[PDB]
Amino acid sequence: SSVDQKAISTIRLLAVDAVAAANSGHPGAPLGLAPAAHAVFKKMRFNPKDTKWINRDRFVLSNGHACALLYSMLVLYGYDLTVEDLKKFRQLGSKTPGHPENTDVPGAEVTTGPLGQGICNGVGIALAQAQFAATYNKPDFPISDSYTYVFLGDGCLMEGVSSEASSLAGHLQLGNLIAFWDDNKISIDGSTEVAFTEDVIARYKSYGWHIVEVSDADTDITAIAAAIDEAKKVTNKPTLVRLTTTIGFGSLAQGTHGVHGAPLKADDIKQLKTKWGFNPEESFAVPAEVTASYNEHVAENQKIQQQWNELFAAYKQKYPELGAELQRRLDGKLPENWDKALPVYTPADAAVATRKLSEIVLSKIIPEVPEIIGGSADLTPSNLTKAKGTVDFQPAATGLGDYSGRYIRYGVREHAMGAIMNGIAAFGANYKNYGGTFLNFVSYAAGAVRLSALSEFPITWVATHDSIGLGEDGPTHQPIETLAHFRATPNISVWRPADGNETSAAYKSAIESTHTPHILALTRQNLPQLEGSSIEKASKGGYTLVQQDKADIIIVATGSEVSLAVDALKVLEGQGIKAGVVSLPDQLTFDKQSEEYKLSVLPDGVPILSVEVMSTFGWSKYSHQQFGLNRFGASGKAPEIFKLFEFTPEGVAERAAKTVAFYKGKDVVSPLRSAF
Amino acid sequence: SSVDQKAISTIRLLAVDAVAAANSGHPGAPLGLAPAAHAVFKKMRFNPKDTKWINRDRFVLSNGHACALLYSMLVLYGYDLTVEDLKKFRQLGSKTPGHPENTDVPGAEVTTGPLGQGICNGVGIALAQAQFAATYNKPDFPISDSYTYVFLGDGCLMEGVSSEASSLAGHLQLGNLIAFWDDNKISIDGSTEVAFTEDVIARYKSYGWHIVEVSDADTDITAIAAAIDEAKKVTNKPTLVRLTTTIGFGSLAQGTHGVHGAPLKADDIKQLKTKWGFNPEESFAVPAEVTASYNEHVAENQKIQQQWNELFAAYKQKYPELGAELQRRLDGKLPENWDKALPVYTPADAAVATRKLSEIVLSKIIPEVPEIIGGSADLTPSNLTKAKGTVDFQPAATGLGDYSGRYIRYGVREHAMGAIMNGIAAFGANYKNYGGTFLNFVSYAAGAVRLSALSEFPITWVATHDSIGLGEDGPTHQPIETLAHFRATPNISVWRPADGNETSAAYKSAIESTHTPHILALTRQNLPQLEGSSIEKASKGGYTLVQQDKADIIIVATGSEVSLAVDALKVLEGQGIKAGVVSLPDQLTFDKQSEEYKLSVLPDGVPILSVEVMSTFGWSKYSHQQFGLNRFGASGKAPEIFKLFEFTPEGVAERAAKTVAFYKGKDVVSPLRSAF
Ligand SMILES: CC1=C(CCOP(=O)(O)OP(=O)(O)O)S[C@@H](O)N1Cc1cnc(C)nc1N
Ligand SMILES: CC1=C(CCOP(=O)(O)OP(=O)(O)O)S[C@@H](O)N1Cc1cnc(C)nc1N
Ligand SMILES: [Ca+2]
Ligand SMILES: [Ca+2]
């Protein structure tokens, strides 16, 4: 249609004008993908006035540098984003940052820009939708039937994380996922011939995806719409639509790397405008006939949501218990008193590894909290992440599970697991999802973990085998730097529970979270139940385990080293030194407590020694002296490794005594004090 | 042959017995892969008495958990590893750690165990061999003609890093790479049907690999040998050999996940021995006829190396300059006085971004040091990593470069780039290789970076756009935690040079390195040349830039914040406060200096404030108070972001004045002091 052509030109020119105003950003992919964006958004069901409608189709821009395109679509459709915001693209404090951020941009489902992430997030949105539909849909009640549309480029296809997620999505037969490859044969280094000559289509067929090819995606919106219709008929395979485009279509510099990532020249923008019937003297034009056309689609979508709300009301009458559960989840509330299922321990109970305590927690809470789902990256019998009696999330056609299942076999795919977890969280409906691996291999997923923090998603890593305590697998498996890395990242709760009560507190935090990802660092080896622990105290992140009013020293420790500190206190008593013990299961939670609470744990006037069998980085926030492990580990039986490195009651006591001596005659204030 | 069958049984039983003695480790893949290991090592050229022969074939065990297999081969072939070492498998301090470590195990080319790494390392060994051969071979002088053999399993094939490297290896037409997939249909979570149902062979064809399938790799060594011969005929494609095996072949528990990763039962070991003609009462048997057979292959290989040494002598006569260059490289020596090519600056010179200073360094040193090669992960015009006038490393058949080229187009593949760099270093011949990306995306490669440190490889990351100084791309691109992460990892030199002289010092360190990987954190934005910098002083890692004998405070800073500190010193002077400035371009190098040198930089008796626009973790090693950035960044013009966060001369001065006030009346000792 004439109006469709005008809409595509409007999108292209809004994106170009936004880049021009900022004198920064990426015009090439927006120019190339405007036809496809127009066609996809016309097929999508969404409400710009209710961005959280649970049955909306989701869109993800994995090639996030192309965000001037996304912002233009959101503005044209009347989301809470305006032309005035587009004029502030890439400007400090604006609603139009240089890559899309879900916390800041209405209609941005996830935070993209780091390549490869968005397609994996789309896999997770689609996984969640399938699980959600299997859980709630009934005959005559299609509560959930939405699609997940993803745009990606060559860069996303080169990043290994996307291969992981695409292999898994094909295995999982995720037929409501429809991805679109911007096949423009250009990246920053020039032609894809220099580095990216694989047969992408053949690779996607090998994963079990359906393929549709659109040879002229610069103009053929009829074929793009038809490709979507075709994809919707293939209910047991995710679909990749090859969009053969010209990067920067219409620019004098189209088809070149120079159009990827810098503003166009002013004369180039003028010729674009006149070629397309726009005024070359005008910027940020929005023809009223485009607004009218887009408004008609919004109004239709709002009537669809209106009818869905009536369907949901009827569902609550026909299926009273499921309807109440669904309502509670859409309200963002956990079941009343769910935390009464958390296991509680006493000091008379047996020693247990915190990985096994975690298994026990999951066993108790999964039956009580339906919005918990999770999995492991091929470490299920090691991480202990599956509750007995649950069914795996698999397509029923495989015989290996069902979409109503609760447990995901991620395979050896940590990075994609992390990004898929972000997508499950992004779906909404109160999903509280988790992923297991060895702590040292959470590092394989750092790209996604950082985005969990920036995106404010309440995902959880069940990160077992946390230290040299794992023993014989040796230094390639033993974390040193890992907790420092994640603790140094803003907005990550890094729990390292010492015992049963602390493990329950860690899960209480992880499941109640709405804005903060969690990493639970858990042991291979057994640890005793501590005298003085409780869920109540551990929920403060740091607490006084052993109070000593006339302390010569306080030992602050985490995880497996708390019991070590308690044993060292006894050695010290025989040397005439009185120690207190602080357990610090989560530094972030502790930091968020009141100043007075924190000072009650780490007071002035007493030296404080930290003990944790990994990097000492960060620990000066809480201690004057630090006993840690700042070298790689060793392959041997774990107790022998602890002895080698002097992580023994006597080794801790020796360092505590040296700390007391070092501060003799000195005035000591809390590590919590600072000059500014 | 009868002896070949006996050798295969010997290998299997040595591996099983090693696992049994440790009561730890992985018997399954060794049992399944013994026939293939026997066949491959019989085809390989190697000298157990000269592990560094530059024309040896290389073997890499990417499925490193299977290392009892590797250790058995090395023992049988008379490497510096014995049956007594096998009896100490997985025991503290042994030469047979639970995953292979190149620093500890003769004949282990790389450190494997973290899945996916070894195949990528093999790509790098093969890349280096092709570059090396193109550089040195002449008519009648095949100085380098060796192959790279890699074993991998399902786990390596699931990890995205291997997809990245396999796509690139296919593009690069690396015909001397021969990989073998242990197609046993089992991983830790059980059948591969639960998570890994892709058509692997079709995927590898899509990358441009050649395929050979061996349907009965439990017995058919004739077919495995024939597959190697076939692979050698295909000179323009890497080859994947599908070895269809039974995990744990021969065990009562063969073909099950239980055989993957735990010792066999004692009765199972007895029946293995009698089925294969061994004494069930005996462990660690080495039949003398197996030793004889293997010794004959060693003796033949040693005669091949003897002839290669004569070829090399003749090459030095026929090609005097190339021969001397090759000899120098094989001696591990850089060119005499190579560092005279490093650029030197004065304070009268213009401000320059450290990414551009890096380009200039590379431009000067690449022509002087032939063993430097490197590339970028699709960021060549941003990282500024290519010297003008050099040719890319590409197969000549593409027309895009040649194997004699110096510059690698890695594509958007940071993790594989990191692991490929490790393989290039592992090849030897003094290669000093580098890889560019944005600092924030070095994190995508953490799995490989950690292994650079553990493996002691002198690789270099050219990690540009280091901070909020990059501006508009925003918080998804702006490092916060990244330097803390890598500084907390043992054995990583993390240079953050402030100016031209410091950038030259950083490269001097990176290129001279033999055992320590480097990360060079470089700016987008221009920085002034500093009064007081030099290569000499910056080579100490930390140095006094501005000495103030009556200092009220010392400001320690890195990178872009050194100039900020110098400007703050001027503000402070107007407030009656005298400051000194320390520049700390590499914390690891500084830490390695003498205690007296370090105390001359960070003396007792004066408060010290650190300034660096990223995490404060680690900084308490060097300072009493820390001014850093412990939250995510922002999308805007960089100077506006610095102002927002008060990284301005006045903001630094305010915090310095507060630091002076906080220590009034207190006794202050160097942050370098400690109790133990
Ligand atoms: C290489 C790179 C880009 C080119 C994309 O090439 P692609 O074909 O995807 O984009 P097109 O040129 O528009 O067609 S964008 C810039 O982000 N980036 C840096 C970049 C690198 N690594 C990661 C993980 N995320 C990034 N963001
Ligand atoms: C999952 C896993 C393994 C199964 C391999 O399954 P694969 O098919 O490769 O082995 P096979 O069972 O012998 O046939 S090993 C153990 O390392 N590991 C943990 C592991 C996880 N992630 C990373 C990066 N490295 C690892 N090392
Ligand atoms: Ca592209
Ligand atoms: Ca396997």
Side-chain angles (χ1 to χ4, degrees):
Chain A
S1 89
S2 163
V3 78
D4 287 344
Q5 172 67 95
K6 191 168 293 185
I8 290 166
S9 297
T10 298
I11 294 160
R12 285 182 166 146
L13 295 170
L14 285 177
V16 162
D17 284 340
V19 171
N23 202 34
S24 181
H26 300 78
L31 284 164
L33 285 169
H38 170 80
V40 162
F41 275 72
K42 282 306 189 91
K43 291 285 182 183
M44 284 168 53
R45 299 306 182 192
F46 58 89
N47 187 352
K49 311 325 199 229
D50 185 359
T51 60
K52 296 303 187 178
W53 174 34
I54 202 69
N55 202 35
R56 69 190 182 273
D57 296 321
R58 278 77 170 172
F59 177 79
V60 177
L61 188 74
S62 194
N63 47 344
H65 58 276
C67 61
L69 177 64
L70 174 62
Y71 302 156
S72 295
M73 300 310 294
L74 298 173
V75 166
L76 289 169
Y77 276 115
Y79 282 75
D80 184 27
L81 199 67
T82 67
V83 165
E84 292 305 305
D85 299 313
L86 295 179
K87 292 177 179 178
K88 296 186 288 196
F89 181 54
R90 284 171 169 262
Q91 184 185 99
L92 188 62
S94 83
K95 290 170 68 167
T96 48
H99 293 86
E101 294 164 22
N102 61 275
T103 63
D104 289 16
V105 181
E109 298 288 343
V110 285
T111 296
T112 59
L115 292 159
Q117 298 290 327
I119 177 60
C120 302
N121 300 152
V123 172
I125 292 168
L127 194 166
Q129 186 281 323
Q131 204 280 337
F132 188 72
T135 300
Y136 295 106
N137 288 8
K138 291 291 182 184
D140 298 327
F141 290 95
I143 296 302
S144 176
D145 61 8
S146 58
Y147 287 82
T148 303
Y149 294 97
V150 181
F151 282 8
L152 60 90
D154 303 306
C156 291
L157 292 173
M158 283 183 255
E159 282 289 1
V161 69
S162 72
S163 283
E164 293 177 15
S166 298
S167 178
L168 183 56
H171 169 70
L172 292 172
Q173 298 182 27
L174 296 176
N176 283 22
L177 178 62
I178 308 172
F180 301 76
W181 169 29
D182 188 7
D183 170 30
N184 63 21
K185 301 170 189 60
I186 291 290
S187 68
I188 284 175
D189 277 22
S191 177
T192 52
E193 289 301 294
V194 310
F196 183 57
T197 53
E198 61 172 63
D199 186 343
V200 173
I201 298 309
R203 178 162 63 89
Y204 271 76
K205 296 177 181 174
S206 82
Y207 296 145
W209 289 51
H210 184 64
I211 307 295
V212 189
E213 299 181 300
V214 178
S215 58
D216 183 5
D218 292 321
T219 61
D220 198 347
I221 62 172
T222 301
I224 301 173
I228 293 162
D229 294 342
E230 176 177 340
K232 291 195 175 183
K233 292 38 184 180
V234 183
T235 57
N236 64 342
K237 302 180 184 183
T239 296
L240 184 66
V241 180
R242 182 186 188 173
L243 298 173
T244 298
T245 74
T246 307
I247 196 176
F249 180 84
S251 169
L252 298 177
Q254 70 177 11
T256 72
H257 72 87
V259 90
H260 156 82
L264 303 186
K265 301 68 62 206
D267 69 305
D268 187 16
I269 298 175
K270 291 175 185 179
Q271 69 83 30
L272 286 180
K273 287 169 181 173
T274 56
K275 184 148 63 186
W276 293 333
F278 285 60
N279 183 348
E281 302 183 0
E282 185 178 8
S283 298
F284 301 95
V286 182
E289 60 269 43
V290 172
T291 300
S293 177
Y294 278 31
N295 281 353
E296 178 179 353
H297 180 47
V298 169
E300 291 166 332
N301 285 350
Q302 288 169 337
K303 291 295 186 185
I304 294 169
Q305 182 180 359
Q306 181 179 308
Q307 293 168 274
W308 183 91
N309 284 338
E310 297 311 301
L311 185 74
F312 182 40
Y315 180 82
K316 291 179 193 174
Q317 192 175 0
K318 183 85 179 171
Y319 298 98
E321 61 296 299
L322 283 167
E325 175 177 299
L326 177 54
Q327 179 70 64
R328 176 191 57 69
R329 288 176 62 162
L330 298 181
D331 288 339
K333 300 174 183 171
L334 287 162
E336 291 285 70
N337 296 133
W338 76 279
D339 61 302
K340 292 193 190 278
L342 291 167
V344 172
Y345 295 82
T346 77
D349 290 327
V352 188
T354 62
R355 67 177 174 140
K356 178 65 176 191
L357 293 163
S358 169
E359 189 189 67
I360 295 163
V361 172
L362 288 168
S363 84
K364 299 311 178 191
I365 70 174
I366 283 170
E368 301 309 310
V369 185
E371 58 262 54
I372 298 174
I373 65 175
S376 175
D378 198 51
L379 284 170
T380 297
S382 298
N383 300 154
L384 307 178
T385 37
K386 183 173 180 178
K388 193 183 162 303
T390 59
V391 162
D392 293 352
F393 180 87
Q394 302 273 189
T398 67
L400 296 173
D402 185 59
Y403 288 148
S404 66
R406 304 287 291 274
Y407 192 74
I408 303 159
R409 303 291 183 163
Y410 282 99
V412 194
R413 301 184 181 103
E414 301 82 9
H415 197 178
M417 180 173 74
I420 290 166
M421 289 201 283
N422 287 337
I424 293 167
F427 180 86
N430 218 44
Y431 274 113
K432 307 296 187 162
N433 75 114
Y434 68 85
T437 185
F438 294 151
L439 176 58
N440 200 50
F441 304 130
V442 179
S443 303
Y444 268 49
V449 174
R450 192 183 199 259
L451 286 162
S452 305
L454 186 55
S455 304
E456 302 177 17
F457 291 143
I459 63 75
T460 300
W461 289 80
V462 180
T464 73
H465 298 64
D466 71 320
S467 78
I468 55 159
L470 70 86
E472 292 92 330
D473 283 347
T476 65
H477 285 56
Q478 294 161 345
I480 299 294
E481 70 289 6
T482 322
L483 299 192
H485 172 194
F486 294 121
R487 287 168 172 157
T489 304
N491 195 41
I492 307 184
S493 183
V494 179
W495 286 80
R496 189 167 185 258
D499 75 352
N501 292 327
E502 298 198 354
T503 301
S504 282
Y507 271 99
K508 190 173 183 296
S509 183
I511 300 303
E512 290 178 349
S513 185
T514 57
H515 293 90
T516 300
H518 283 56
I519 299 174
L520 267 60
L522 303 166
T523 68
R524 181 185 182 203
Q525 77 275 20
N526 289 351
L527 298 177
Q529 305 319 312
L530 298 166
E531 181 69 39
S533 70
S534 57
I535 301 178
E536 172 55 36
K537 289 193 185 64
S539 78
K540 302 288 268 159
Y543 66 101
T544 303
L545 181 72
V546 180
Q547 172 63 35
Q548 172 53 257
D549 293 314
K550 294 197 91 190
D552 301 305
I553 191 168
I554 290 172
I555 306 174
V556 59
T558 68
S560 50
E561 284 64 76
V562 180
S563 60
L564 179 61
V566 171
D567 287 336
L569 179 163
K570 184 194 129 279
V571 174
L572 286 164
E573 190 196 10
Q575 301 178 19
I577 294 170
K578 295 193 205 161
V581 177
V582 168
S583 183
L584 187 54
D586 179 31
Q587 299 183 354
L588 177 55
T589 297
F590 180 69
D591 285 353
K592 292 172 177 172
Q593 305 306 308
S594 73
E595 292 316 305
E596 186 271 340
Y597 176 78
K598 295 186 292 187
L599 284 161
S600 81
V601 178
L602 305 172
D604 292 332
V606 59
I608 302 175
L609 170 66
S610 62
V611 185
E612 178 177 82
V613 77
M614 48 266 285
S615 174
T616 54
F617 275 35
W619 273 107
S620 55
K621 291 169 64 181
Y622 307 113
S623 62
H624 301 101
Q625 302 290 315
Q626 302 80 42
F627 183 28
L629 186 61
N630 287 313
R631 55 155 280 180
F632 290 115
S635 176
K637 296 174 176 75
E640 299 176 18
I641 312 173
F642 278 78
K643 287 179 178 151
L644 175 66
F645 297 137
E646 302 185 356
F647 282 83
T648 64
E650 297 69 32
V652 173
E654 177 185 290
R655 289 166 177 78
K658 286 176 177 180
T659 296
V660 172
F662 182 78
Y663 290 105
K664 194 135 182 210
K666 298 181 182 164
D667 291 318
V668 177
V669 305
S670 177
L672 296 171
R673 305 307 188 169
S674 63
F676 54 82
Chain B
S1 89
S2 163
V3 78
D4 287 344
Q5 172 67 95
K6 191 168 293 185
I8 290 166
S9 297
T10 298
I11 294 160
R12 285 182 166 146
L13 295 170
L14 285 177
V16 162
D17 284 340
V19 171
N23 202 34
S24 181
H26 300 78
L31 284 164
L33 285 169
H38 170 80
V40 162
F41 275 72
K42 282 306 189 91
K43 291 285 182 183
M44 284 168 53
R45 299 306 182 192
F46 58 89
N47 187 352
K49 311 325 199 229
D50 185 359
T51 60
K52 296 303 187 178
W53 174 34
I54 202 69
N55 202 35
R56 69 190 182 273
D57 296 321
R58 278 77 170 172
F59 177 79
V60 177
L61 188 74
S62 194
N63 47 344
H65 58 276
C67 61
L69 177 64
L70 174 62
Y71 302 156
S72 295
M73 300 310 294
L74 298 173
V75 166
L76 289 169
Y77 276 115
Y79 282 75
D80 184 27
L81 199 67
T82 67
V83 165
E84 292 305 305
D85 299 313
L86 295 179
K87 292 177 179 178
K88 296 186 288 196
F89 181 54
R90 284 171 169 262
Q91 184 185 99
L92 188 62
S94 83
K95 290 170 68 167
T96 48
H99 293 86
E101 294 164 22
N102 61 275
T103 63
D104 289 16
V105 181
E109 298 288 343
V110 285
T111 296
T112 59
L115 292 159
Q117 298 290 327
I119 177 60
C120 302
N121 300 152
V123 172
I125 292 168
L127 194 166
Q129 186 281 323
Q131 204 280 337
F132 188 72
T135 300
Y136 295 106
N137 288 8
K138 291 291 182 184
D140 298 327
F141 290 95
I143 296 302
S144 176
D145 61 8
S146 58
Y147 287 82
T148 303
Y149 294 97
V150 181
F151 282 8
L152 60 90
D154 303 306
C156 291
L157 292 173
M158 283 183 255
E159 282 289 1
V161 69
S162 72
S163 283
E164 293 177 15
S166 298
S167 178
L168 183 56
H171 169 70
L172 292 172
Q173 298 182 27
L174 296 176
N176 283 22
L177 178 62
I178 308 172
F180 301 76
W181 169 29
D182 188 7
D183 170 30
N184 63 21
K185 301 170 189 60
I186 291 290
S187 68
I188 284 175
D189 277 22
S191 177
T192 52
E193 289 301 294
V194 310
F196 183 57
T197 53
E198 61 172 63
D199 186 343
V200 173
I201 298 309
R203 178 162 63 89
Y204 271 76
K205 296 177 181 174
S206 82
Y207 296 145
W209 289 51
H210 184 64
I211 307 295
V212 189
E213 299 181 300
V214 178
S215 58
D216 183 5
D218 292 321
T219 61
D220 198 347
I221 62 172
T222 301
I224 301 173
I228 293 162
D229 294 342
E230 176 177 340
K232 291 195 175 183
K233 292 38 184 180
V234 183
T235 57
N236 64 342
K237 302 180 184 183
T239 296
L240 184 66
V241 180
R242 182 186 188 173
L243 298 173
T244 298
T245 74
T246 307
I247 196 176
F249 180 84
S251 169
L252 298 177
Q254 70 177 11
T256 72
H257 72 87
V259 90
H260 156 82
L264 303 186
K265 301 68 62 206
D267 69 305
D268 187 16
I269 298 175
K270 291 175 185 179
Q271 69 83 30
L272 286 180
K273 287 169 181 173
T274 56
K275 184 148 63 186
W276 293 333
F278 285 60
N279 183 348
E281 302 183 0
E282 185 178 8
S283 298
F284 301 95
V286 182
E289 60 269 43
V290 172
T291 300
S293 177
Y294 278 31
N295 281 353
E296 178 179 353
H297 180 47
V298 169
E300 291 166 332
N301 285 350
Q302 288 169 337
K303 291 295 186 185
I304 294 169
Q305 182 180 359
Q306 181 179 308
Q307 293 168 274
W308 183 91
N309 284 338
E310 297 311 301
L311 185 74
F312 182 40
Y315 180 82
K316 291 179 193 174
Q317 192 175 0
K318 183 85 179 171
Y319 298 98
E321 61 296 299
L322 283 167
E325 175 177 299
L326 177 54
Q327 179 70 64
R328 176 191 57 69
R329 288 176 62 162
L330 298 181
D331 288 339
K333 300 174 183 171
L334 287 162
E336 291 285 70
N337 296 133
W338 76 279
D339 61 302
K340 292 193 190 278
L342 291 167
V344 172
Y345 295 82
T346 77
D349 290 327
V352 188
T354 62
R355 67 177 174 140
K356 178 65 176 191
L357 293 163
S358 169
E359 189 189 67
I360 295 163
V361 172
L362 288 168
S363 84
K364 299 311 178 191
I365 70 174
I366 283 170
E368 301 309 310
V369 185
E371 58 262 54
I372 298 174
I373 65 175
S376 175
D378 198 51
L379 284 170
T380 297
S382 298
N383 300 154
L384 307 178
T385 37
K386 183 173 180 178
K388 193 183 162 303
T390 59
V391 162
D392 293 352
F393 180 87
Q394 302 273 189
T398 67
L400 296 173
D402 185 59
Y403 288 148
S404 66
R406 304 287 291 274
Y407 192 74
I408 303 159
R409 303 291 183 163
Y410 282 99
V412 194
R413 301 184 181 103
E414 301 82 9
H415 197 178
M417 180 173 74
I420 290 166
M421 289 201 283
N422 287 337
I424 293 167
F427 180 86
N430 218 44
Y431 274 113
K432 307 296 187 162
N433 75 114
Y434 68 85
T437 185
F438 294 151
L439 176 58
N440 200 50
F441 304 130
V442 179
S443 303
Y444 268 49
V449 174
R450 192 183 199 259
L451 286 162
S452 305
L454 186 55
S455 304
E456 302 177 17
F457 291 143
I459 63 75
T460 300
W461 289 80
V462 180
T464 73
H465 298 64
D466 71 320
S467 78
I468 55 159
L470 70 86
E472 292 92 330
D473 283 347
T476 65
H477 285 56
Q478 294 161 345
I480 299 294
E481 70 289 6
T482 322
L483 299 192
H485 172 194
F486 294 121
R487 287 168 172 157
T489 304
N491 195 41
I492 307 184
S493 183
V494 179
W495 286 80
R496 189 167 185 258
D499 75 352
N501 292 327
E502 298 198 354
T503 301
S504 282
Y507 271 99
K508 190 173 183 296
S509 183
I511 300 303
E512 290 178 349
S513 185
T514 57
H515 293 90
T516 300
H518 283 56
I519 299 174
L520 267 60
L522 303 166
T523 68
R524 181 185 182 203
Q525 77 275 20
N526 289 351
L527 298 177
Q529 305 319 312
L530 298 166
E531 181 69 39
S533 70
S534 57
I535 301 178
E536 172 55 36
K537 289 193 185 64
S539 78
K540 302 288 268 159
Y543 66 101
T544 303
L545 181 72
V546 180
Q547 172 63 35
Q548 172 53 257
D549 293 314
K550 294 197 91 190
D552 301 305
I553 191 168
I554 290 172
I555 306 174
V556 59
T558 68
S560 50
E561 284 64 76
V562 180
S563 60
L564 179 61
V566 171
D567 287 336
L569 179 163
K570 184 194 129 279
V571 174
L572 286 164
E573 190 196 10
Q575 301 178 19
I577 294 170
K578 295 193 205 161
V581 177
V582 168
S583 183
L584 187 54
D586 179 31
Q587 299 183 354
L588 177 55
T589 297
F590 180 69
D591 285 353
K592 292 172 177 172
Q593 305 306 308
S594 73
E595 292 316 305
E596 186 271 340
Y597 176 78
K598 295 186 292 187
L599 284 161
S600 81
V601 178
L602 305 172
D604 292 332
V606 59
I608 302 175
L609 170 66
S610 62
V611 185
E612 178 177 82
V613 77
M614 48 266 285
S615 174
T616 54
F617 275 35
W619 273 107
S620 55
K621 291 169 64 181
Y622 307 113
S623 62
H624 301 101
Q625 302 290 315
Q626 302 80 42
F627 183 28
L629 186 61
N630 287 313
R631 55 155 280 180
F632 290 115
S635 176
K637 296 174 176 75
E640 299 176 18
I641 312 173
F642 278 78
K643 287 179 178 151
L644 175 66
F645 297 137
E646 302 185 356
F647 282 83
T648 64
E650 297 69 32
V652 173
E654 177 185 290
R655 289 166 177 78
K658 286 176 177 180
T659 296
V660 172
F662 182 78
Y663 290 105
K664 194 135 182 210
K666 298 181 182 164
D667 291 318
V668 177
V669 305
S670 177
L672 296 171
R673 305 307 188 169
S674 63
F676 54 82

